[PDB]
Amino acid sequence: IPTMKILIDENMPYAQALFSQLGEVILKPGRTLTADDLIDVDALMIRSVTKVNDALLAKANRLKFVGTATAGMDHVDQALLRERGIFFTAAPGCNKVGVAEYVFSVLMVLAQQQGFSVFDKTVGIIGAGQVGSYLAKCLSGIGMKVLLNDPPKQAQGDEREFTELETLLKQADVITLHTPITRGGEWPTHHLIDAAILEQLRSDQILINAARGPVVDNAALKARLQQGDGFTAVLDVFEFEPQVDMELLPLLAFATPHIAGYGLEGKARGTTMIFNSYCEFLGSAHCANPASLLPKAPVPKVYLERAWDEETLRTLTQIIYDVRKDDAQFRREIHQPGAFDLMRKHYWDRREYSAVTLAGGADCHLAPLAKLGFQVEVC
Amino acid sequence: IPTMKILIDENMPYAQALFSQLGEVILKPGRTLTADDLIDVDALMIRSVTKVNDALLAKANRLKFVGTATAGMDHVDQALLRERGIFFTAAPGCNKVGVAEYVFSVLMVLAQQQGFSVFDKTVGIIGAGQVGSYLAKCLSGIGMKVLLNDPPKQAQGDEREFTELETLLKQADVITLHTPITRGGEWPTHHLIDAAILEQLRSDQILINAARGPVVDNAALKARLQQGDGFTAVLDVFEFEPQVDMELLPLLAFATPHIAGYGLEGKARGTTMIFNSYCEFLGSAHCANPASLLPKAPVPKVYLERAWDEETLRTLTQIIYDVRKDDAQFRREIHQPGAFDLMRKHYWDRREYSAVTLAGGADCHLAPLAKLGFQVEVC
Ligand SMILES: NC(=O)c1ccc[n+]([C@@H]2O[C@H](COP(=O)([O-])OP(=O)(O)OC[C@H]3O[C@@H](n4cnc5c(N)ncnc54)[C@H](O)[C@@H]3O)[C@@H](O)[C@H]2O)c1
Ligand SMILES: NC(=O)c1ccc[n+]([C@@H]2O[C@H](COP(=O)([O-])OP(=O)(O)OC[C@H]3O[C@@H](n4cnc5c(N)ncnc54)[C@H](O)[C@@H]3O)[C@@H](O)[C@H]2O)c1
Ligand SMILES: [Cl-]
Ligand SMILES: [Cl-]
Ligand SMILES: [Cl-]
Ligand SMILES: [Cl-]
């Protein structure tokens, strides 16, 4: 029987098991892919390590489909793909779930450490794409007040209610960034949080940047933190990572090596999403989800005796992710050579709220917890 | 129908509900009890706020039984009680459970923060009474190596295998204190951990004192910590509490205001134990337990998919108690007037491992977790 010839990155998780259903699978390390590797190849499945150039496709005589198991697609010349009719797809938002649960962990722990309620704090989301909109969904789901800012999408006709920047920077208690890094365009994000903005940030305001490094001027962030007025900053991304300011590090409430979106589920969605895309491209009925591929969580379900309070919410969410874990490892190991990248490479088997089932009675208020991302079960 | 007349401290938890089954209950604040209050009184149930003097019993014409809902009994002249035939009982070990789970939390978090395995660390218990023996049971239950030291009990004929002090101080990684505070006697405990001992403590050794304040010379503890060689100390009790050395405080890994044994269950055991004692004293069949009196825990049961690792153990135990919570509040509030005592008075609804049921399959290894204190259920 004739089959499609599918070239796939060797280290794409669950790739062989999934795509073998769709035809002949060739597994090769993505960094060493040459032009000859695409001879007689119908479809290509890659990660970020493979650059889709003119060079790579020089002998792609059968290439009709290209899928990248990533949320981003800068490693792909998609103007090239477009001009020669090659269908292209990524996995947008494949790792957005982790970021939301990362931000929530940060809020939850800071609430405990500084002694306040998260339901008193207004979160301002700058960047309402895949990541921001999911975070906006989760926070609003449990009844927190969100503030969305997005000048590009608002100009494109997005009819969500957007808050203007200077308003958000004043009206919001917590400021979280979820934008790309851009120097040009109508709405550049390089040093979006600059010196002038930082010094107008109050002592009871929290700044979180788990978007991209250069969005926050790290030098300016340090200067703002060295006043010691109680201003609070959390960085998952650094302006010149893997290098970080070792003077700034002990001033940051939490510091982690670009691992907010990490997690087995999100990593599996990379493969899962482009697999479903290619399935649909072939006209196949096959369909896959990360829940089916992964083993069940260590603590897959817990039971609730009554309705949840803020304390129970902290208890439940920290079963999955506690930001203090990564923070501690990062500070402990960063002095070691290449520890920034090695910590990411050997990241632990982190899950997400969907891996855990919350079982309760109709009087336990699980509907907000379901919107937060948990699986629920009314007894 | 004739009944026993029972005088009880107004603020003893669940006292009226329990003891009303045994006869007439009179509720009066323990600090304001006078001699006249014991006229025609058959039994007395008190806390620490009531001092049992010659003065208090001056008109106790019917007093036959005295119960104090405490583990200690220094507030009681029991030489007086003995010489006039009054049966006396306390509630020994009523709050020992919390201390063990406190110590374990400290070990669990320090293991995460410093990056090590608790199953690599040998815990040396100094003081093998109610508290120490329960801790020894819990740690050995999950497979940790314990080291018991107790010169008084060893001299009295206790045939457990005891380790000599200087040996324990060298052979053990973690040193936890669970002794009373004594200046005299054959085995005094005042400054038991002194200057000479502290300076022979290694950089990879941990010292925990949740026993009594003056057992550790706090001034010497500070001097040892100011070297910055990596030595680690945790205090639940301070030499001159509620006053603490504000120079020592930021050097302590964890600092809490004498709340290790706190928890609803332990607090209820105070009433429960002396109630059962008095029941037995009357020849009654009535019997009570704190589990029946308390509401069920917020998260009363969780399920396990597989056997537990060290990470899962941390996840499970921190559902009940996470020492970082109290530590954060203590450091945040201590500057406030009387915050040391007020934090204890308005302590949160803390539980214990027995309040949570761990459900799994026969292959989940719950037997050690049961010995740790959890309720288990093999499916
Ligand atoms: N730290 C992490 O673990 C982690 C993980 C994944 C993604 N990210 C970062 O997520 C950002 C969000 O990712 P995404 O997948 O949602 O991409 P996205 O493009 O869907 O989202 C960003 C949103 O950015 C808006 N935007 C662009 N410029 C803006 C500006 N100047 N002001 C306000 N909004 C602006 C975009 O138009 C859109 O509204 C990127 O930096 C992404 O790489 C971080
Ligand atoms: N921090 C807390 O929350 C908290 C709570 C309850 C009790 N405690 C402290 O517990 C200590 C343990 O309490 P307990 O109820 O088990 O009392 P206990 O008398 O049963 O226990 C202490 C054990 O102390 C041994 N001991 C006395 N001197 C010793 C010495 N010099 N060296 C080694 N062992 C010695 C006693 O003989 C016994 O073996 C007391 O200080 C108790 O008040 C602390
Ligand atoms: Cl596979
Ligand atoms: Cl990108
Ligand atoms: Cl009562
Ligand atoms: Cl005492």
UniProtKB/Swiss-Prot annotation, chains A, B:
Subcellular location: Cytoplasm
EC nos: 1.1.1.290
Keywords: Cytoplasm, NAD, Oxidoreductase, Pyridoxine biosynthesis
Primary enzyme class: oxidoreductase
MF-aspect GO terms: 4-phosphoerythronate dehydrogenase activity; NAD binding; protein dimerization activity
Chain segments annotated as coiled-coil in the UniProt record: none
Residue sites binding substrate per the record: 48, 70, 262
Catalytic activities: 4-phospho-D-erythronate + NAD(+) = (R)-3-hydroxy-2-oxo-4-phosphooxybutanoate + NADH + H(+)
Record pathway: Cofactor biosynthesis; pyridoxine 5'-phosphate biosynthesis; pyridoxine 5'-phosphate from D-erythrose 4-phosphate: step 2/5
Subunit structure: Homodimer.
Name the UniProt record assigns to this protein: Erythronate-4-phosphate dehydrogenase
Organism: Vibrio cholerae serotype O1 (strain ATCC 39315 / El Tor Inaba N16961)
Gene: pdxB
